[PDB]
Enzyme design. Structure first.
Site, PDB file in Angstrom:
ATOM      1  N   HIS A 101       2.511  -1.618  45.378  1.00 26.55           N
ATOM      2  CA  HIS A 101       1.529  -2.560  45.918  1.00 26.55           C
ATOM      3  C   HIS A 101       1.459  -2.562  47.438  1.00 26.55           C
ATOM      4  O   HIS A 101       0.473  -3.063  47.994  1.00 26.55           O
ATOM      5  CB  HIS A 101       1.840  -3.997  45.493  1.00 26.55           C
ATOM      6  CG  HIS A 101       1.383  -4.355  44.121  1.00 26.55           C
ATOM      7  ND1 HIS A 101       0.056  -4.350  43.749  1.00 26.55           N
ATOM      8  CD2 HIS A 101       2.077  -4.790  43.041  1.00 26.55           C
ATOM      9  CE1 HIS A 101      -0.043  -4.729  42.487  1.00 26.55           C
ATOM     10  NE2 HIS A 101       1.168  -5.001  42.034  1.00 26.55           N
TER      11      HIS A 101
ATOM     12  N   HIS B 164      -8.054 -11.883  48.720  1.00 28.02           N
ATOM     13  CA  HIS B 164      -7.107 -10.885  48.263  1.00 28.02           C
ATOM     14  C   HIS B 164      -5.881 -10.835  49.163  1.00 28.02           C
ATOM     15  O   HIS B 164      -4.904 -10.140  48.841  1.00 28.02           O
ATOM     16  CB  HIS B 164      -7.820  -9.519  48.185  1.00 28.02           C
ATOM     17  CG  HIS B 164      -7.017  -8.438  47.534  1.00 28.02           C
ATOM     18  ND1 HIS B 164      -6.269  -7.538  48.265  1.00 28.02           N
ATOM     19  CD2 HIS B 164      -6.861  -8.095  46.233  1.00 28.02           C
ATOM     20  CE1 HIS B 164      -5.672  -6.694  47.438  1.00 28.02           C
ATOM     21  NE2 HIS B 164      -6.017  -7.009  46.201  1.00 28.02           N
TER      22      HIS B 164
HETATM   23  O1  GHM Z   1      -1.914  -7.754  38.846  1.00 28.27           O
HETATM   24  C1  GHM Z   1      -2.403  -6.601  38.990  1.00 28.27           C
HETATM   25  O2  GHM Z   1      -2.630  -5.863  37.995  1.00 28.27           O
HETATM   26  C2  GHM Z   1      -2.728  -6.099  40.390  1.00 28.27           C
HETATM   27  C3  GHM Z   1      -2.824  -4.742  40.650  1.00 28.27           C
HETATM   28  C4  GHM Z   1      -3.124  -4.313  41.934  1.00 28.27           C
HETATM   29  C5  GHM Z   1      -3.326  -5.237  42.951  1.00 28.27           C
HETATM   30  C6  GHM Z   1      -3.644  -4.739  44.363  1.00 28.27           C
HETATM   31  O3  GHM Z   1      -4.769  -4.953  44.881  1.00 28.27           O
HETATM   32  O4  GHM Z   1      -2.769  -4.111  45.004  1.00 28.27           O
HETATM   33  C7  GHM Z   1      -3.231  -6.594  42.677  1.00 28.27           C
HETATM   34  C8  GHM Z   1      -3.448  -7.639  43.774  1.00 28.27           C
HETATM   35  O5  GHM Z   1      -2.914  -7.481  44.895  1.00 28.27           O
HETATM   36  O6  GHM Z   1      -4.169  -8.651  43.566  1.00 28.27           O
HETATM   37  C9  GHM Z   1      -2.929  -7.021  41.398  1.00 28.27           C
END
Ligand code: GHM
Length: 437
Positions: free
Chosen positions: A102, A327
């Site tokens: 992430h 975000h």
């Molecule tokens: O919960 C998930 O599946 C998820 C996957 C990727 C991201 C991202 O943008 O890096 C996020 C977030 O940061 O909201 C959440």
């Protein structure tokens, strides 16, 4: 400003709300430095879009993409990058199930020095278009003269801590960046690095990562005040993991306990969680598609309805961003009247055990599934006892720019948390559409 905390540009707000904001093209502009090489740590990449954000004269400089994709997803990313001979890829190992890469970070090597950018946006057009996103911009770090022996370290230990974060990948392409960082002077850095990497940590290593890292920094570099029990904790995020059957399983037992820490001495502290309601998403600039980036699933939510009584709406009049869905992820410790804060964290970490860590083996081991990265603003690192909250994010220097409104507003009785994989067909969004997953 001492803090160098920015929001991304939002298309559709008045110019006064973008005056001090940054687009990715601004970050990569030659005005920030003469680019030699860069590393882009992220989760999701649109490679064609990404290369177009670099200035034309810099588009053939080496780029390293650090990602966590496997199998067909990995093949798709390699296929995206193959047209560009200057792009290399580094697959971060994810040896624990259900983990993800992430971390959102740019390492920017210039002829003039080095810059580090720690931020919250994926490298796709939509994440920089109409969302609320956060950016921390490092100073321009000069190179240490060849033959000179000095640490280049800051009082916050940022250089050693960033190298430690990169060492955890055990990757040859990142050893090259570690050697670059060793050669630069990072001593002007006034933030603390808070990272997560996958693993099971015991003993000394327990304090290296996740919410134990946060706890250690608050113990060592913040002071407790009288009536500390009245200073709330605020957490603000774009997704929620499975937290357990009740608040005592993780949220209010080890997570809140780390976030409550202040100073070295040995709970009714209010906890405010900020997460967009369905109405927030429906009336947003993007409409319902903004919920594609708020991935709270009905399967997770239906097992923890207890959690939603903690939820507060997204509101950001202070930065003109109430309709720009968040975000960014932030955590902070305001005073009881929300006029001061004891600390502020901006990070990639959502409200999940995967990101922050969960205790295992009778409380002796911290298990983390994912890579995450954020920076912590502590008043002591700025010669202060607390930060005064800036009243208008973009208005007229030791006041901290909190990007959303305080106090947070509790959900109304008809409000519901945004849940991405169920339909909403009662009322249309700002583009005239319903949501049918
Ligand atoms: O919960 C998930 O599946 C998820 C996957 C990727 C991201 C991202 O943008 O890096 C996020 C977030 O940061 O909201 C959440």
């Amino acid at each position: 400003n001492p803090f160098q905390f920015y929001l991304t540009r939002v298309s559709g707000v008045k110019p006064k709300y973008n005056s001090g904001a940054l687009h990715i093209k601004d970050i990569l502009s030659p005005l920030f430095g003469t680019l030699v090489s860069s590393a882009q740590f992220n989760y999701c990449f649109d490679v064609d879009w990404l290369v177009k954000q670099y200035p034309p004269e810099f588009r053939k400089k080496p780029i390293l993409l650090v990602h966590g994709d496997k199998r067909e997803a990995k093949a798709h990313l390699h296929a995206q990058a193959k047209p560009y001979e200057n792009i290399s890829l580094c697959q971060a190992k994810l040896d624990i199930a259900f983990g993800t890469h992430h971390t959102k970070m740019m390492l920017l090597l210039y002829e003039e020095g080095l810059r580090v950018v720690i931020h919250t946006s994926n490298l796709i057009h939509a994440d920089w278009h109409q969302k609320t996103q956060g950016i921390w911009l490092s100073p321009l770090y000069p190179r240490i003269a060849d033959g000179t022996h000095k640490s280049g370290e800051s009082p916050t230990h940022f250089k050693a801590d960033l190298i430690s974060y990169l060492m955890a990948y055990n990757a040859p392409s990142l050893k090259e960046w570690i050697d670059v960082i060793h050669k630069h002077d990072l001593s002007e850095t006034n933030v603390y690095l808070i990272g997560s990497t996958p693993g099971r940590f015991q003993g000394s290593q327990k304090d290296n990562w996740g919410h134990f890292r946060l706890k250690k920094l608050l113990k060592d570099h913040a002071s407790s005040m009288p009536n500390a029990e009245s200073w709330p904790v605020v957490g603000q995020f774009s997704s929620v993991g499975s937290l357990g059957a009740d608040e005592s399983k993780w949220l209010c037992s080890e997570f809140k306990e780390s976030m409550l820490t202040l100073g070295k001495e040995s709970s009714s502290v209010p906890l405010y969680l900020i997460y967009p309601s369905v109405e927030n998403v429906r009336t947003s600039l993007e409409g319902y598609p903004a919920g594609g980036s708020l991935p709270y699933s009905i399967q997770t939510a239906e097992k923890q309805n207890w959690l939603h009584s903690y939820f507060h709406k997204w509101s950001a009049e202070t930065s003109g961003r109430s309709n720009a869905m968040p975000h960014i992820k932030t955590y902070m410790r305001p005073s009881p009247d929300f006029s001061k804060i004891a600390w502020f964290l901006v990070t990639s970490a959502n409200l999940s055990k995967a990101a922050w860590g969960a205790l295992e083996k009778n409380g002796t081991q911290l298990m983390i599934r994912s890579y995450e990265l954020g920076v912590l603003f502590l008043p002591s690192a700025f010669g202060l006892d607390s930060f005064k909250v800036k009243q208008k994010f973009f208005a007229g220097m030791a006041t901290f720019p909190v990007p959303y409104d305080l106090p947070p507003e509790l959900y109304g009785s008809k409000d519901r948390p945004w849940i991405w994989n169920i339909p909403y067909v009662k009322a249309p969004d700002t583009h005239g559409n319903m949501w049918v997953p």
